RNA sequence: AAGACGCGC
RNA sequence: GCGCAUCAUCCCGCGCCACCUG
């Protein structure tokens, strides 16, 4: 009966979790990992003629509601 | 379990025995085989012995559909060891087969296995995630990874 | 199949910065963190130069870094938050010159997780508590205290978790000896995901949450929740307490907001903009970095905008109420990730890209001629940018962090490969040529006819700062020169020597010794000359020069020992040395500081044997050791840091024998096979040795490591030193029939570079086969071309003329006459789908260009290559991939074009021939077998040259995703998919079809591929992984390839090549990363060496953990498990630990530290 | 712990103190009950260590004589970066054992 | 003599 | 009700967690 650690974690699905929740969790994890990794953030800031601060600001705003509105 | 990393040379000698034990004959045989696989996977981790570990997983995997708590625990331990040895990519590939199966029990077991995989070593699944085509109402494609320099 | 990982160049880009007194003294020091390297460096106020003092690798990703100190203390500690789920507090020990761990507390799992703390770190200004926060749902608070033993203590973490919330920034708030206070930009999103109407973006405002820390109750509680009008970016800590009022500044879009707890009214002030902005007015303006200066008299804040404008923020306040915020324009600097304002009027700017500068503040500009702004002014603001006035540039640090493309080739006349790197971003982009060796300075040229064998310099004083007498002696002539700030011939030398001078040194205060093959002379100011003639008709070969030791070597080995008594006269000992071999070279040891005579002394022979002569009177002029040599000795010298000797022979060798009567370590390397003479040089006021050969080499030892570096100059027959007030570090290294003076200004340890400025950032470039010219293509997103910029400027001029401001609008001529530099003031550009493209041909030797081609405003250049076709003759055609209407965030492209050029006149100019429309963007250009491969989206196409456009030949629609690079060899090609690892395609020429026969099973976002054999391909990863894939030998041409090697460098890799670096060496897999680091991979030549290296690595991992508490095996097995790779970073760091553990592991490996270090350096000196 | 599924862990934030083990549980691992390769120490939470609970065995609850440790496999499996590994339940077997011993003793 | 778990005649 | 099988499962003889008491 060691399911306490399963329930006490945020970001994992369960029996009747739909596709939208899984995809938004994936997008949030991807954004957080992008922010954590310096090399990928530098690559993104090199790809576009912008600054790292602006890139991370826009990425933070993208965390509000990814994958459109819920259905 | 005792020898640890030194026993990577003896992996090939026990593969036929593990294959014979993993056959659907006795539950205790399956539990013992799963324990052996988990212990060997933990021992030889980090030295590049995936060739036989993948073959062992190919026979260990069909044992997930069980009801006895002991064999479930043994199978979960074996799959956790195989995950920490091979990597989360192969585990995600295997668990993606029936994440949305029409039936309920297979969906439940696949979801619990996916949760167990996702709890540990989450930072690699982002690279191991597949590509999902977006619908006409929602966006499901990470366009940031398609940038080319 | 086992490779050894090395690192030739460390990472240079700076991600974080901090300053403080980390050594316990009044001297300020700067601690900056690289991508995965933590190093300490401090500037010198007297000269303005910056020198690194310590550099270590943490084997982890650093997400935060800041310093703090306890109340009443004098030392500042270091706190770093890594990807591992633990926090560590560091401390710098000046005596040990290393970081000492003081504490280590674990609070969660490792890795960059969403709900694991480590992203945000806050420290209380007074230095009593530290707060660590995560991206979502997690927050922890720790208590810092000092026990009765004056040691740091750590308390238990505090529960401060809030479900379903997002945190933007966390920073401490000064309270002034009250309970510590923390403020964060916490906001909720629970209702965002519960609304199906799509109103989540609307009616959702940020909140400024405040958190106490009650020491009495030992718990944390939320204080307020104030909604914000607009989204903020980051907060500023205002120095509170007795010096200034407590508060926080909020940076947002075009506004700055001041807020404080209690009854503090909000203050707003718009951010000033430039005059006649060339960017899009709809684009907002934000802040990228900020600094502070907590001066006791008055504090002020410095901030930088997106375009690099520096604003001096001055806060005007009453005793307890804030009145207004006064902004003022200070200067303009390149955009910097972090900025630190140092004491004693020094400012350090850690630029985001390119070199890092160190400005010096001279004038504070308090109420200058330029008007200042304030929040009390009703309604925007405009200011006119000006060149650098307040700041003065003093010193800058060279950097090459944003490398996008690297190629190595021998494009020069010398027989040494050169490293060409394409780095930089935007207008600051430049092309650098990395060359192995040392810096060469040229300031004096003197062509003197004759044969100058050597030059001797003797000072009139024992430690004279300026040279007095210079012995410019030729092979068949004699001359003397002197320097007195006017280079003129000296007359009172009084030498009277016709035969060439053997040697001249400083025997005493001004005692010069002249040796000629027909006797012995003496030079002195007083009438004290010990002139002696050569016995019989014999000759003298070599003489000994030292402070108080003189030994003359004649034919037959008859040595005469001269000892200088304090009286002054020279005396000969009763014992003489005689053998059957002559003496051709010998060296002497420096006099001990306390003793009047040393003991170590080595004299060579002709029979390939070297002996040791004791200077003690008990056994003077007696042999000590019988050490044979492979070749005839040529020179010898002693190098200090504790004592080492270098042995020179007839061939090119340099044995680094440890100080011992009998030979110990035998480590020699090639320096062909020219005679080598060893002489002392100057390097940061130290002692070193020099080797002369067909190419000269120099050896130096900085912090217990010896590096061999050559000189980037022609062959030199002799060299000497030079001391002066302006240039204390001077080298007089004459050459064949000429005189040359060298100097060592910078360190120049490895890869000296020259800066060749560009216009836009470079993507790819190629090298002409016979013309040896570089064709570089540049492209930027959201950019304006020259024609578009001119049209926009003209339109603005017409608009302001039509404004008709009183007819009196004559400012158009002045506005159009002056244009701000793009490199210094930035490039004013904007848009959403704008692009640029410039085709440039540049001569590698010089910085001049040959031709420039400009395309339309909405064309982006991606790939370029040069090849020939069978239908045409030997003309070298150039194909450039061009994209049309490319939008990045939403994937949608209208089309693409491909260009064709002739490149007539040995690649000096380009002529347009025709263009061919392409439905999608062209990915890469791959020419083979007289044709080219065109990457069109997910379709593979084969094109042939025609009369007006390219002709379609073959198609392949079996590729799923978009191609991102094609490589060809033999009769088969490989396709690198954006998601899939690799695709193997074989071209059936007879059938004229493309068939796929092999593919990989593990997807990966590959960026650069570099095949190693007919069936082995090595490719990089976007996340920073290096893998090698080998095709099974039983393949037929379904079949799947297998991976044989995996590794995680930790930084994105955009370059991969397998070419030799050092002449006479072996092939190595050199790679360059996006962070500015260069590394190579070394195969193992024996099983015993591989076993020893693996055992050493395992023992170091078990015994010496990384500084940030991250598992080395887990760090290397980040995305994929490590496979057949041995890390050399731990092996190199083994030389930095204290002796106890290294010796202990030495007997644990049944070996000894000296030969272990020798084996470690053998790989470095063999493959690099 | 592993053998008896009834026993559960408090799973609270780890503190600064170090747990202890009795003579019977001297070498047992706090999770998988193994006597192989003890590498890292065991941290206890503030609630589990207060007053009388100080110096008590983590697994059973006897007097503390030796420090607890984590095995090599547990460290590899990243299982030590979790909550407090102290059992708060008293175990079903112990109650029945004590009752029968008191009856027949 | 004891805490749990699963296996059919 | 029979025959079984698994968990280096228990086999420890009594323990002690703020208290009784005019
Ligand atoms: Zn116990
Ligand atoms: Zn606990
Ligand atoms: Zn364990």
Domain presence at residue D21: yes
By DSSP bridging, strand C951-956 and strand C939-944 are antiparallel
Asked if the C-beta of A2 comes within 8 angstroms of chain D's C-beta atoms, the answer is yes
Interface contacts A/B by beta carbons within 8 Å: 55
DSSP states of C1111-1145 as a string?
-HHHHHTSSS--BSEEESHHHHHGGGS-HHHHHHH
Q: From the candidates B80, B104, B138, B147, which should be mutated to test the interface with A, based on the most A CB atoms within 10 A? A: B138
- State how far the Cα of C248 lies from the Cα of C237, in Å rounded to an integer: 5
Structure tokens that stand for C91 in this block: 């401390």
- State how far the Cα of C330 lies from the Cα of B41, in Å rounded to an integer: 62
Are B110 and B93 contacting, i.e. CB atoms less than 8 angstroms apart?
A: no
- CA C1097 vs. chain centroid, Å, equals 26
Within 8 A of C189 by CB-CB distance, chain A residues are 63-65
- State how far the Cα of B105 lies from the Cα of B90, in Å rounded to an integer: 22
Residues 6 or more apart whose CB falls under 8 angstroms from that of B60 comprise B22, B33, B34, B37, B75, B78, B79, B82
- State how far the Cα of C34 lies from the Cα of C40, in Å rounded to an integer: 11
Residues 6 or more apart whose CB falls under 8 angstroms from that of C487 comprise C481
Domain presence at residue D104: no
Per this entry, what is the length of chain C?
Answer: 1168
Residue with tokens 């054992």: D97
- State how far the Cα of C50 lies from the Cα of C43, in Å rounded to an integer: 4
Task: Report the residue from D36, D76, D78 with minimal CB separation from B1.
Answer: D36
Give ∠ CA C202-C205-C207 in degrees, rounded to 5: 165
- State how far the Cα of D92 lies from the Cα of C965, in Å rounded to an integer: 65
Are C1028 and C1069 contacting, i.e. CB atoms less than 8 angstroms apart?
A: no
| Buried-state track C582-602, b at ≥16 Cβ within 10 A, e below 16 | bbbbbbbbeeeeeeebbebbb
Return the residue of B nearest to C778 by Cα.
B149
Are C355 and C396 contacting, i.e. CB atoms less than 8 angstroms apart?
A: yes
- State how far the Cα of C274 lies from the Cα of C383, in Å rounded to an integer: 5
Task: Report the residue from C109, C1120, C1124 with minimal CB separation from B87.
Answer: C1120
Largest CA distance in chain B: 57
By DSSP bridging, strand C273-274 and strand C382-383 are parallel
Domain region containing D83 = 8-88
**Chain D 73-92, residues with CB within 8 Å of chain C CB atoms:** 78, 80-81
Q: Which nucleotides of F are covered by protein (CB under 7 A)?
A: 5-10, 12-14, 17-18
Structure tokens that stand for C1129 in this block: 């970073």
Asked if the C-beta of A51 comes within 8 angstroms of chain C's C-beta atoms, the answer is yes
- State how far the Cα of C927 lies from the Cα of C916, in Å rounded to an integer: 17
Count of C-beta atoms within a 10 Å radius of residue C656: 21
- Report which DSSP code applies to C518: T
Structure tokens that stand for C1056 in this block: 């991969």
- State how far the Cα of C286 lies from the Cα of C232, in Å rounded to an integer: 9
Per this entry, what is the length of chain D?
Answer: 105
Q: Which helix (H) or strand (E) holds B18?
A: helix B11-21
Q: Where are the beta strands (DSSP E) in C229-299?
A: 232-238, 247-252, 255-259, 267-270, 273-274, 287-293
Q: Which nucleotides of E are covered by protein (CB under 7 A)?
A: 1-7
- State how far the Cα of C1030 lies from the Cα of C1017, in Å rounded to an integer: 7
- State how far the Cα of C595 lies from the Cα of C394, in Å rounded to an integer: 45
Residue C699 pairs in a beta bridge with C689, C708
- Estimate in Å the CA B60 to C1' F3 gap, whole number: 31
β-sheet with C586-588: strand ranges across: C586-588, C601-604, C609-612, C627-628
Q: What is the CA radius of gyration of chain D?
A: 14
Whether D39 has a binding-site annotation, put simply, is: no
Are C90 and C1137 contacting, i.e. CB atoms less than 8 angstroms apart?
A: no
Q: Could A4 and D5 be called an inter-chain contact, meaning their C-beta atoms sit closer than 8 Å?
A: no
Q: Is the CB of D105 under 7 A from strand F?
A: yes
Q: Which of C220, C67, C239 is nearest to C133 (CA)?
A: C220
Nucleotide with C1' nearest the D35 CA: F8
Q: Is the CB of D77 under 7 A from strand E?
A: no
Domain presence at residue D96: no
Task: Report the residue from D15, D16, D78 with minimal CB separation from C109.
Answer: D78
Domain presence at residue D56: yes
By DSSP bridging, strand C430-434 and strand C418-423 are antiparallel
- State how far the Cα of A57 lies from the Cα of C251, in Å rounded to an integer: 12
Q: Where are the beta strands (DSSP E) in C508-595?
A: 515-516, 519-520, 532-533, 540-543, 549-554, 559-564, 570-572, 586-588
- CA C483 vs. chain centroid, Å, equals 39
Task: Report the residue from B46, B86, B149 with minimal CB separation from C404.
Answer: B149
Q: Where are chain A's structural domains?
A: 6-70
Whether D84 has a binding-site annotation, put simply, is: yes
In chain D, residues 82 through 101 whose Cβ sits under 7 angstroms from any atom of nucleic acid strand F: 93, 97, 101
Within 8 A of A8 by CB-CB distance, chain D residues are 11
Structure tokens that stand for C403 in this block: 């490398």
Residues 6 or more apart whose CB falls under 8 angstroms from that of C1084 comprise C2, C3, C4, C1090, C1093
Domain presence at residue D37: yes
Q: Is the dihedral of CA C551, C553, C557, C558 positive or negative?
A: negative
Are B118 and A9 contacting, i.e. CB atoms less than 8 angstroms apart?
A: no
CA distances from C893 to B140, C804, C880, C924 (A): 19, 43, 18, 17
Alpha helices, DSSP H, located in C181-283? none
Count of C-beta atoms within a 10 Å radius of residue C183: 24
Q: At what angle do helices B88-95 and B69-86 cross, to 10 degrees?
A: 130
Asked if the C-beta of C1062 comes within 8 angstroms of chain A's C-beta atoms, the answer is no
Domain count of the fold of chain D: 1
Domain presence at residue D57: yes
Q: Could A67 and B122 be called an inter-chain contact, meaning their C-beta atoms sit closer than 8 Å?
A: no
- State how far the Cα of C357 lies from the Cα of C399, in Å rounded to an integer: 10
Resolution (A): 3.6
Residues 6 or more apart whose CB falls under 8 angstroms from that of C921 comprise C862, C881, C883, C886, C893, C896, C937
CA distances from D47 to C221, C674, D54, D83 (A): 20, 77, 10, 12
- State how far the Cα of C440 lies from the Cα of C731, in Å rounded to an integer: 10
- Report which DSSP code applies to C264: P
- State how far the Cα of C468 lies from the Cα of C482, in Å rounded to an integer: 6
HSE, side-chain direction, 13 A CA sphere, residue C363 = 10
Q: Is the CB of D5 under 7 A from strand F?
A: no
Asked if the C-beta of A6 comes within 8 angstroms of chain D's C-beta atoms, the answer is no
- CA C32 vs. chain centroid, Å, equals 13
- Estimate in Å the CA D61 to C1' E4 gap, whole number: 21
């Amino acid at each position: 009966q060691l399911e306490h650690l399963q329930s006490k974690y945020i970001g994992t699905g369960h029996a009747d979790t739909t596709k939208w929740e899984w995809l938004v969790n994936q997008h949030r994890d991807s954004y957080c990992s992008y922010m954590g990794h310096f090399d990928l953030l530098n690559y993104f800031a090199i790809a576009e003629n912008e600054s790292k601060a602006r890139v991370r600001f826009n990425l933070m705003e993208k965390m509000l509601q990814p994958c459109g509105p819920p259905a | 379990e005792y020898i640890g990393e030194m026993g990577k040379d003896y992996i090939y000698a026990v593969t036929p025995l593990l294959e014979d034990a993993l056959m659907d004959r006795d539950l205790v045989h399956r539990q013992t085989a799963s324990a052996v696989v988990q212990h060997m996977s933990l021992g030889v981790y980090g030295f590049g012995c995936e060739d036989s570990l993948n073959h062992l997983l190919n026979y260990v995997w069909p044992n997930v559909f069980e009801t006895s708590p002991h064999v479930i625990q043994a199978v979960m331990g074996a799959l956790e060891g195989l995950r920490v040895a091979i990597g989360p990519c192969r585990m995600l590939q295997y668990c993606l087969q029936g994440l949305f199966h029409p039936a309920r029990k297979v969906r439940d077991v696949y979801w619990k296995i996916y949760n167990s995989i996702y709890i540990g070593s989450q930072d690699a699944l982002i690279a191991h995630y597949p590509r999902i085509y977006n619908d006409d109402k929602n966006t499901y494609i990470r366009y940031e990874l398609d940038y080319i320099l | 199949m086992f490779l050894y990982n090395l690192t030739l160049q460390r990472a240079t880009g700076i991600s974080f910065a901090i300053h403080g007194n980390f050594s316990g003294t009044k001297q300020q020091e700067i601690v900056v963190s690289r991508g995965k390297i933590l190093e300490l460096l401090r500037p010198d106020p007297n000269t303005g130069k910056v020198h690194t003092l310590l550099t270590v690798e943490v084997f982890g990703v650093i997400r935060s870094l800041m310093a703090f100190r306890l109340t009443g203390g004098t030392k500042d500690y270091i706190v770093v938050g890594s990807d591992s789920g633990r926090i560590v507090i560091l401390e710098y020990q000046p005596s040990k010159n290393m970081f000492e761990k003081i504490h280590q507390e674990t609070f969660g799992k490792s890795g960059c997780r969403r709900i694991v703390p480590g992203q945000f770190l806050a420290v209380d200004p007074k230095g009593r508590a530290v707060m660590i926060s995560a991206i979502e749902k997690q927050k922890l608070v720790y208590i810092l205290n000092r026990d009765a033993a004056a040691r740091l203590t750590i308390s238990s973490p505090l529960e401060a978790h809030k479900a379903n919330t997002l945190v933007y920034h966390v920073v401490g708030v000064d309270v002034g000896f009250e309970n510590p206070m923390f403020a964060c930009l916490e906001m909720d999103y629970e209702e965002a995901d519960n609304d199906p109407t799509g109103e989540a973006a609307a009616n959702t405002q940020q909140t400024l949450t405040f958190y106490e820390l009650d020491l009495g109750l030992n718990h944390v509680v939320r204080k307020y929740s104030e909604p914000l009008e607009e989204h903020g970016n980051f907060l500023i800590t205002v120095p509170g307490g007795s010096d200034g009022p407590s508060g926080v500044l909020i940076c947002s879009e075009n506004y700055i907001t001041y807020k404080n707890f209690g009854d503090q009214p909000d203050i707003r002030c718009p951010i000033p903009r430039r005059r006649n902005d060339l960017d899009d007015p709809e684009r907002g303006m934000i802040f990228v970095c900020s600094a502070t200066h907590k001066t006791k008299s008055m504090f002020f804040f410095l901030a930088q905008t997106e375009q690099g404008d520096i604003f001096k923020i001055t806060l005007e306040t009453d005793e307890d109420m804030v009145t207004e915020i006064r902004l003022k324009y200070f200067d303009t600097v390149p955009v910097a990730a972090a900025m630190c304002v140092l004491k004693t009027g020094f400012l350090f700017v850690a630029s985001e890209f390119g070199n890092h500068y160190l400005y010096q503040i001279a004038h504070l500009g308090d109420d200058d001629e330029e008007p200042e702004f304030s929040s009390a002014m009703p309604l925007t603001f405009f200011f006119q940018p000006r060149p650098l006035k307040n700041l003065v540039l003093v010193d800058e640090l060279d950097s090459l962090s944003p490398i996008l493309f690297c190629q190595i080739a021998d494009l020069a006349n010398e027989d040494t490969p050169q490293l060409y790197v394409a780095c930089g971003r935007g207008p600051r982009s430049s092309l650098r040529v990395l060359r192995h060796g040392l810096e060469v300075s040229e300031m004096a040229v003197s062509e003197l006819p004759g044969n100058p064998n050597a030059v001797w310099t003797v000072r009139r004083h024992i430690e004279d700062e300026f040279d007095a007498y210079i012995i410019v002696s030729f092979v068949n002539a004699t001359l003397v020169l002197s320097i007195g700030e006017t280079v003129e011939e000296v007359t009172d030398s009084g030498f009277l020597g016709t035969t060439p001078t053997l040697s001249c040194s400083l025997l005493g205060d001004d005692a010069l010794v002249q040796v000629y093959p027909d006797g012995i002379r003496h030079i002195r100011a007083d009438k004290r000359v010990n002139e002696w003639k050569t016995p019989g008709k014999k000759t003298i070969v070599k003489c000994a020069v030292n402070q108080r030791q003189v030994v003359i070597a004649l034919t037959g080995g008859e040595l005469v020992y001269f000892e200088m008594d304090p009286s002054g006269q020279l005396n000969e000992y009763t014992e003489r040395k005689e053998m059957s071999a002559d003496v051709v070279c010998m060296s002497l040891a420096n006099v001990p500081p306390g003793e009047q005579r040393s003991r170590f002394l080595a004299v060579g022979l002709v029979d390939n044997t070297v002996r040791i002569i004791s200077l003690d009177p008990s056994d003077c002029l007696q042999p000590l050791s019988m050490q044979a040599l492979p070749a005839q000795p040529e020179s010898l010298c002693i190098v200090e840091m504790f004592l080492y000797l270098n042995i020179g022979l007839q061939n090119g060798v340099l044995l680094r024998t440890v100080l011992d009567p009998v030979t110990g370590d035998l480590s020699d390397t090639r320096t062909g096979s020219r005679p080598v003479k060893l002489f002392r040089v100057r390097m940061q006021g130290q002692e070193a040795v020099l080797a002369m050969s067909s190419r000269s080499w120099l050896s130096y030892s900085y912090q217990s490591r010896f590096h061999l570096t050559p000189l980037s100059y022609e062959t030199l027959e002799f060299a000497s030193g030079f001391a002066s007030e302006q240039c204390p570090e001077g080298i007089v290294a004459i050459s064949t029939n000429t005189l040359r003076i060298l100097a060592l200004e910078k360190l120049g340890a490895v890869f000296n570079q020259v800066a060749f400025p560009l216009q836009y950032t470079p993507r790819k470039f190629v090298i002409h086969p016979e013309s040896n010219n570089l064709i570089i293509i540049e492209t930027d997103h959201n950019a304006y071309t020259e024609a578009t910029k001119a049209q926009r400027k003209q339109q603005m001029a017409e608009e302001m003329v039509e404004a008709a401001g009183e007819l009196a609008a004559e400012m158009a001529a002045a506005f159009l006459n002056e244009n701000l530099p793009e490199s210094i003031f930035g490039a004013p550009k904007a848009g959403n789908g704008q692009w640029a493209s410039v085709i440039r041909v540049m001569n590698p030797i010089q910085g001049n260009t040959l031709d420039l081609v400009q395309l339309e405003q909405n064309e982006a250049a991606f790939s370029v290559a040069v090849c020939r076709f069978s239908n045409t003759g030997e003309d070298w055609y150039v194909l450039v991939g061009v994209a049309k209407d490319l939008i990045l965030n939403p994937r949608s492209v209208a089309g693409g074009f491909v260009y064709t050029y002739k490149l007539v006149n040995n690649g000096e100019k380009l002529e347009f021939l025709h263009k061919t429309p392409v439905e999608e963007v062209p990915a890469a250009i791959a020419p083979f077998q007289g044709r080219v491969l065109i990457g069109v989206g997910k379709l593979l196409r084969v094109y042939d040259l025609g009369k007006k456009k390219l002709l379609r030949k073959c198609e392949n629609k079996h590729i799923a995703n978009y191609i991102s690079g094609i490589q060809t060899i033999g009769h088969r090609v490989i396709v690198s998919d954006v998601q899939e690892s690799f695709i193997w395609v074989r071209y059936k020429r007879n059938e004229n079809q493309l068939i796929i026969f092999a593919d990989d099973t593990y997807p990966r976002w590959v960026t650069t591929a570099s095949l190693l054999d007919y069936d082995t391909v090595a490719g990089a990863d976007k996340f920073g992984n290096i893998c090698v894939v080998r095709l099974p030998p039983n393949t037929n041409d379904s079949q799947k390839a297998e991976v044989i090697m995996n590794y995680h460098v930790g930084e994105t890799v955009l370059s991969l090549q397998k070419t030799t670096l050092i002449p006479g060496g072996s092939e190595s897999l050199v790679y360059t990363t996006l962070s500015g680091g260069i590394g190579i991979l070394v195969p193992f030549t024996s099983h015993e060496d591989h076993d020893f290296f693996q055992h050493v690595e395992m023992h170091l991992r078990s015994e010496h953990p990384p500084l940030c508490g991250r598992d080395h095996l887990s760090f290397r097995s980040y995305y994929f498990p490590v496979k057949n790779v041995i890390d050399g970073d731990l092996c190199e760091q083994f030389n930095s630990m204290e002796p106890n553990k290294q010796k202990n592991v030495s007997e644990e490996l049944d070996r000894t530290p000296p030969e272990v270090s020798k084996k470690l350096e053998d790989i470095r000196t063999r493959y690099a | 712990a592993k053998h008896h599924p009834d026993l559960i862990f408090c799973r609270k934030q780890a503190g600064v103190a170090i747990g202890r083990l009795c003579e019977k549980c001297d070498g047992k691992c706090v999770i998988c009950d193994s006597y192989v390769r003890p590498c890292t120490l065991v941290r206890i939470c503030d609630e589990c260590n207060y007053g009388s609970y100080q110096g008590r065995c983590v697994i059973c609850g006897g007097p503390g004589v030796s420090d607890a440790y984590y095995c090599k496999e547990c460290t590899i499996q990243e299982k030590d970066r979790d909550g407090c590994p102290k059992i708060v339940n008293l175990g079903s077997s112990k109650t029945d054992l004590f009752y029968e011993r008191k009856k027949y003793g």
